[model samples]
Structures are given as C-alpha cells and as structure tokens.
Target chain A: KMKVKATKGEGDGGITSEGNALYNNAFMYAYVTTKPGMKYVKWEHDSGVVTVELEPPCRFVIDTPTGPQIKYLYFVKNLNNLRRGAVLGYIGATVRLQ
Target chain B: KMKVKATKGEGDGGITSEGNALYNNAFMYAYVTTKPGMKYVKWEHDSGVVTVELEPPCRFVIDTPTGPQIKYLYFVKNLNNLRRGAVLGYIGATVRLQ
Candidate 1:
C-alpha cells in the first residue's frame, strides 16, 4: 500500500475544459482480498466515516481522514492540482465481490 | 440568499503565501430565523447532504452534493483552487443559536 499526501492542489478545468474530463477518473485502483472470515471493510476519510464490506478483490476509493484510522491502506491524490498543500478533502470507496 | 459558482479557483497558496491565508476563511456569514417554532434548519452542499434546525439565527457552512437534494439553499466555495473547475469537495457547517 502506498500513501500520498497533498496539502494544496490545483484541480483540472473539469469536463467543461473543452471536450470532457472526469474530475475523479478513478486514476487509482486498489485490489484487496477478504480474509477467511470477514464481515465488512471499514474505512474513514477527512469528510466523514464510511464502512464497506470486505469482499474478495475489494476496490476502494481512498479518501481523507484516513490518517486517524489506520496507517497503511492510505494514499493521497491531488484532485485540485494541489502539488504540496494541506486541506480537508473527501474520499470514495467500493468493495468488489468475487 | 446568494449563490456563488467557481469552476477552477486559484487559492491564495493556503496560509503559505507569506500572509498565511486560510484555505477556508469562512468569509461568508448567514443568519436564519425559526418561523414561530421550528426544529432544525435544512441545508445541503455539492459534496454531501446536511440538515440543521432553524434555531433562530442559524449559521451554516455549505458543502457539496447539495444540488442533488435541492437548489435554493446551496452555495459553492473554492477549496482546491476550483474557482472555475468542477470537482468533488466537502463543505462545513456550524449551527449558531441566538
């Protein structure tokens, strides 16, 4: 697991930049396998708290506030083009069932 | 009530531009009144949904995803320098009672 932290970011022009671009194009993808007996995959972000069922090959969208919960399983992405800035942000996650 | 729309904003370096500019300065201040007797104030943002009681002079800090719920009580702020950029962002709220 890789952790990327961003303080301030400069977001893209968005889909209306000319053609059409998705702000969060799911640039990063994480594949996780549930243990033998697991109920659900719990996660948190800077915005709010979220819990996802940990199924085999779970695809999670990394959000903020993750620092308070766990150390690893965290990565930061610059959606607002913040190369090096600190600010509160949100994160999305989805569990993939296999 | 007023509505502000920022696509791609260029933040003030966020408290690091020498003058120490706060990302969210909370420059906007609003006051709401409870009609005779109300429970809470209803508000939303572009990031997520929120509900507050109209406690006579209620203050709120809008967020995102408010558009999906309603339109009137919705406002946008620049977080990641999204003055004119469309991206997923969070909004803060604090209800003040008078």
Candidate 2:
C-alpha cells in the first residue's frame, strides 16, 4: 500500500521517471511464497526477464516471457504475515535508455 | 519474483508460516510510484488495517478494507524500470490465528 506522489530526482533517462508512471501501470502481477522448511530466495535474470527459484519449490511458477509485466510481487508466509500491514522490500531496476 | 516452498520454524502458533502461503492468496493489488519531486513514504494503521498515504500523492489509491488482499505490491519508476526482470518488493503478512 505504497502511495507515490511525485518524483524527486531524475535517472539517466531523457524524460526522467515520474510518480504517476508507477501508479497502476503494471502490466501484470504475481504472488510467490517460500516452501515450508525452506528459507532461501533466488532471483535470476536473463534477456531482461527475471526468474524466481524457490528453496523448497513453490506450488506456482512464473516463467513466461511476459512474467515481468507484474507490478507487485507479494510474498506472504501466512494470512497473518500481512497483519502488520505488509513488510515491504523494494527492488530497484537498472534503467537504460534505448 | 520470490518463491516459497515450506516453513521450518514455528512463530508461537499452531502452524508455522509456509511458502505456499505467500503465493496468490492476495485479494486486491495496486501499483504506486514516487513522484518526480517527492521522496517520502507514510503508512498508517488503524483497527489493524494499514493505510499508505503517499508523500507527494500518487495517482492510484487503495484505501478500502480489501486493499490488503493484494499479494504483490510492486513499485517501479518506469516501464524500463522492469528491465532487469521485475524490480521485486516483498510484503510479509502477520499470521494470527482466528
């Protein structure tokens, strides 16, 4: 439940990144969970696509090319895990203009 | 993307938090980004439900009760922000037995 108001600084792009840009603009979304007795996370990227390899092997997997289209990747260990209101971890993207 | 397999340790509850538990159980999901001039985040919790009030004010807002149902809360600055796969952000839920 992060609310973005406005951009502060410009990246290495011409137009620069904006707030509204990240608001509801995600093409897709996915949910991943670590397996029980499992305590590891693996994220691999190639050709601009990221793949998450779980420790114990999750029930679902997002290996599709368009999988990255997901805006939010929520990981809840249990229904209550979200009780404290979602513990957030932000991952930054490497921006490069074409 | 984060993958969960199985939970090993118990958190003072009958059932411990597991990996499969974090996947796809989200009810509602929303996308938010920082504004060009904003650089702060505010999160408010009342009655156990959390409310995220943007610093500069984001375009999209999810203030409803079911908003927390959103499993993944991905935050990207731009379309290219998702280049190295999706910049991931994981939100952990607090598991409380009913």
Candidate 3:
C-alpha cells in the first residue's frame, strides 16, 4: 500500500487583450493570470517527492527529495475567439521513474 | 468578445481509507479528505456567476449571482490497488445556460 500526495490550484485573470483582426475578421485574445500561492504535486513515489509549478507550456526538472531526477511538462491552448469560433484546450503530464 | 471570470482552487488530502480483501484477493480502498479553503468556479457568463465545492461524487444547484439556476456535478474513481492491479480515474463537469 502507498500514500500519494495531492495539491489544488486556483486561478484568476484580467482579460489581457481582445478584439483584434485575424484574416480581416474580428478575433479575441485573452489569458488567465495564475494567482500566487499556487503549487502542484508532480508525483509521490517510493521515497521520492517531486514538485512543480502551476503554469502551462512549462517544463522543469526536479531533483526529488529521495535522490532522483524527473522531467515534467505542461501545456495549454487558448482559442477564446468565439466570434471566430474557437475552443479552449488544456493538457497535463504525469511523470514516473524508469 | 467577452471577459470570462476565472478562479483558482487548491487542494490537500489525508487519505481516509485503504487495504482490504476482495474476491479472495487483497485490494486497496483510498479516498482523499479535501482540505478547507478549496473552492471551484462553476461558470461565469453574462453577469451570471456560479460557484461549486471541490468534493467529488457531489451534486449541487446554484442560484447564480445573476439570478439563474445551474447544476454541477463532480466525480472521481480510485484504483490504487496496483498490488492487485488497478488504475485511477477522474471526471469533472462544465455547465452553461441554454
């Protein structure tokens, strides 16, 4: 039996920009600002505890608490141009040892 | 163009349960006790602000700040019995007005 650790992340944004021309059509550009005090647990394994940031399109490596290196990656796609008809998308990664 | 409101959520757990005999084989039953100060943004649309709790397998209705009803649902599946061979799964919901 193993006990895995978990963390929650909260987000906020100020609508950075919007209403621009794309191919002569109106498009919107917006982004979310991740507030402070946001942390994420990358993984908890046998004697290893890895941590990571909450930002997307981010990549980092951690020297685990137990003595091992881990590679992590995060990405997000924003298609908030509703006038131009777009969809929002997100992705996350889970890393494990070899 | 619209300005969508966003909020961040953070989480922690004490892992309330585990380890049992099932079908003559050892299995692990685990659950996370969500820490306080965790809140999720249900939806934000045209002056309608909806909020939801961070607990899984939960259902709730919100009389949004803008005066409308919204339904929310959350669920999680734990298969932490890798010793007995299991996989973990999760699901979430997003609601919008008609």
**Strongest candidate by DockQ:** 2
Residue range A1-98, candidate 1, lDDT tens digits: 22332211112232111111112322221112211222332233453443332212111122233321111111122122231111112221111111
Candidates 1 onward: DockQ, in order: 0.03, 0.13, 0.05
Error of 1 at B78 (Å): 55
Off by over 4 Å in 2: A1-3, A13-15, A20-98, B1-90, B94-98
lDDT of 3 by residue, B1-98 (tens): 11112233333442221111111121112112222223332333344654333333221222245543322222112221221111111111122221
lDDT of 3 at B88: 13
**Ranked candidates, highest DockQ first:** 2, 3, 1
Q: Write one digit per residue (lDDT tens) for candidate 3, span A1-98.
A: 11112223333442221111111121211122222222332333354543333323211122245542322222112221221111111111122221
Lowest summed lDDT across 10 adjacent residues in model 2 chain B is found at B53-62
lDDT of model 2 at position A34: 25
Candidate 2 residue B66 Cα shift, in angstroms, is 36
